[model samples]
Target: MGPGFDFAQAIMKKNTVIARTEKGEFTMLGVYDRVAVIPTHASVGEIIYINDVETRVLDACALRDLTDTNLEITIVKLDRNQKFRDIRHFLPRCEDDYNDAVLSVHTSKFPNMYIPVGQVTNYGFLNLGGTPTHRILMYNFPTRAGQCGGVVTTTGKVIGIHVGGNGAQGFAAMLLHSYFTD
Candidate 1:
């Protein structure tokens, strides 16, 4: 574990927003654990709102494709110098290993509801896919209704970024470390 590796400190609150001219505003739910990760499908030259504050997207990349799975994770970069109001530590990123259990923080929608509802659902296993035949983690586990761009985590580490579907999910991770390292 790295410095400041704790659930309360690392897990962020509702701090993601996505909107474009054509769509106006779509479902936007993301985290700010030092870095911001969202879905690539919502990339319509829209400004990302974090904690109700506008931040410039330094870079965005696609980690996977539809062929790989429905879960497509998109990463976003912000000014390194930029600071968030609440948390002030770099949340460690995990790739090579998967934890036994993980939590998914997402925005839930309801009928006749306008604002998105925040939710935290728990999964028994965070590491589901490994072989070429398998591609998703929540196969046996039932998928939940959540917005894209939400984050999934285990303790101090972030396992994946929620893209879509319950079982067929997309996470803009694994390849994310390269952006910070290089």
Candidate 2:
């Protein structure tokens, strides 16, 4: 085994449910925590779009909203053009795996970067496409932003959606296995 680089700086937090800077926006789990709440409507939020048909590039999008409940939840989804799409490599899974899970938005996109304020909270593993309710069900795939809603492996397998994590623990959640989406 090999020691990996510390991606602590990659974690980000902000207000307005939108965290993007000069470097880029960071991926995050969606759900209400002790500090915030997830949005009920998709007025100005992100969304994930994926299909298990072929090895095609997925292009998702999220619009910027005018309001910020600062609910510690993420409302926008990432697109394919975002840089964080490569985060899948950082995740650990069974030996036989191949593929990438990515997310992007209008401005930010990439792994190990930063998320917006009011977008994250104690409850991050909810509201996403594939994330599960129980901590035991959290997937293990390297994550971008849009990966939160649907749970799956790097190989397009479904697993569970993601909500949030303890910044102190690093990337304890937001990963999925390939068999899931299969």
Candidate 3:
């Protein structure tokens, strides 16, 4: 088995939540260590509608120090009353898994179903114009612009957040431990 191909085999075998905007557009998010991380351009104090919960954006960063990738993500510290799933136990300790076979989960229009997608690609390999923006080049696929902030996972653990895609490929914020510990 290859790197990403084998890693993608057991991805997304669990439940992930969908975060929506006021306009009803949605993105995917997964809980890690009791805090929820989202791939969003939303700023601090902005609120995103989640299932049975309204998530407030506590902090955000452009990830200039982490990957120097043009990736922006937000952190959500939830209340005790808020209910969500935690997938921290599934994440890999090594950061290299960030580029393996990764799966992205987005909500489908139908109830009780999620559209799970993935691609096998290497991280830190596809340098976007040599600008240090690590990327995963894949086949042309259906990644709607509205699906930003989606959760990309590997080995059933979150690896990053879906930034956006052009046509043949997309991007995600590599889950740096600093995003959580700090």
lDDT of each: 0.40, 0.27, 0.51
Against the true structure, candidate 2 has what lDDT?
A: 0.27
Candidate 2's displacement at residue 67, Å, is 37
Tens-digit lDDT string for candidate 1 (1-182)? 32322442235433434422232233333334345555555663435554345655666665544456333445566544544342212334333444433333433242112211122332322332331211233312334444344444444444445444435433323323333443
Lowest lDDT sum, 10 consecutive residues, model 3, at 5-14
Sorted by lDDT, highest first, which candidate order results?
A: 3, 1, 2
Clashes of each: 5, 50, 1
Q: Which candidate comes out best when scored by lDDT?
A: 3
Which stretch of 10 consecutive residues in model 1 shows the poorest summed lDDT? 110-119
The parts of candidate 2 lying over 4 Å away from their true place are 1-5, 11-81, 94-132, 135-174, 177-182
lDDT of model 3 at residue 46?
A: 63
User: Which 10 residues in a row give candidate 2 its minimum summed lDDT?
Assistant: 1-10
Please rank every candidate by TM-score, starting with the best.
3, 1, 2
For 22-141, candidate 2 gives per-residue lDDT tens digits of 222333332222111122222223332222111121222221223421222223333323232233333345322223322221222333332212111123333323433322232233
